[PDB]
């Protein structure tokens, strides 16, 4: 569970309409801190976490100026892509892209990566060694060669290794308060008899990494335990639960226990 920075971008062409829609956004861990939309009245990079408002105007002018140059490429990228796969100018299409650095034991990065997908399916990814690319098919194979002739994976290693880690830290410190302080869950359990079922709640926690577990009479029983998708609360926190139907008789003999780096607490009805 190391800290991560991710920039996520998507281009969807709206044929018949105007220029393709472009949304870019950044995440430190599970927290969106910045966003772009060509659809917004004034398309321009802008803050989505208090700790980033702190950055100066020239920082914004440059981030915005840069992502604004991203959209142009992806506009051009969409056509290129539609011509590789020999595709009529009539269907809507989506090109998405992501780039990230993951933090090692000390400062320096643990994993860096950049990748692309076209219409849902994978396309072009930067290799672990940050020095090569895996293409999904003949189409992406063309991009690989372009990248290769353009010596480009250095420029990309550069960022991932330097800039990325660097700013990851800057934002981490400037947001120690929220990025580095874990919210522990306010857990409990609830009843609800059908026959009877037993639900184990975990609310208001950060980050969204949590495991949930119910114990029968001894250890792990996970054959009918309900596995609800971990959801945003709406404030910076998250929410989840696991639940079981038990024969209405031995109820406090079941214990749901949960770990979260914010020791592994254990709880019951």
């Amino acid at each position: 569970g190391s800290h991560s920075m991710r920039y996520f971008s998507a281009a969807v062409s709206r044929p018949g309409r105007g220029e393709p829609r472009f949304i870019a956004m950044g995440y430190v861990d599970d927290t969106q801190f910045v966003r772009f939309d060509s659809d917004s009245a004034c398309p321009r990079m802008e803050p989505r976490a208090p700790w980033v408002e702190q950055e100066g105007p020239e920082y914004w002018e440059e981030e915005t100026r840069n992502t604004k140059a991203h959209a142009q490429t992806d506009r051009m990228n969409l056509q290129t892509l539609r011509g590789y796969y020999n595709q009529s100018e009539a269907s809507s299409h989506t090109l998405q892209w992501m780039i990230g650095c993951d933090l090692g034991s000390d400062g320096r990065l643990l994993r860096g990566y950049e990748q692309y997908a076209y219409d849902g399916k994978d396309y072009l990814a930067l290799n672990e060694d940050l020095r090569s690319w895996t293409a999904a098919d003949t189409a992406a194979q063309i991009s690989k060669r372009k990248c290769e002739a353009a010596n480009v994976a250095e420029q990309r290693r550069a960022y991932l290794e330097g800039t990325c880690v660097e700013w990851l830290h800057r934002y981490l410190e400037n947001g120690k308060e929220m990025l580095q302080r874990a919210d522990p869950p306010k857990t409990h359990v609830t009843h609800h008899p059908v026959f009877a079922t037993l639900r184990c709640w975990a609310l208001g926690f950060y980050p969204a990494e949590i495991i949930l577990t119910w114990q029968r009479d001894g250890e792990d029983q996970t054959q009918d335990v309900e596995l609800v998708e971990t959801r945003p609360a709406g404030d910076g926190t998250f929410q989840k639960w696991a639940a079981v139907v038990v024969p209405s008789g031995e109820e406090q003999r079941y214990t749901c226990h949960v770990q979260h780096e914010g020791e592994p607490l254990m709880l019951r009805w």
Binding site: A24, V34, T73, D74, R156
Partner: peptide, 9 residues
């Protein structure tokens, strides 16, 4: 901070 250039497929 976002990466300046974007690459052309």
């Amino acid at each position: 901070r976002i990466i300046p250039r974007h690459l052309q497929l």
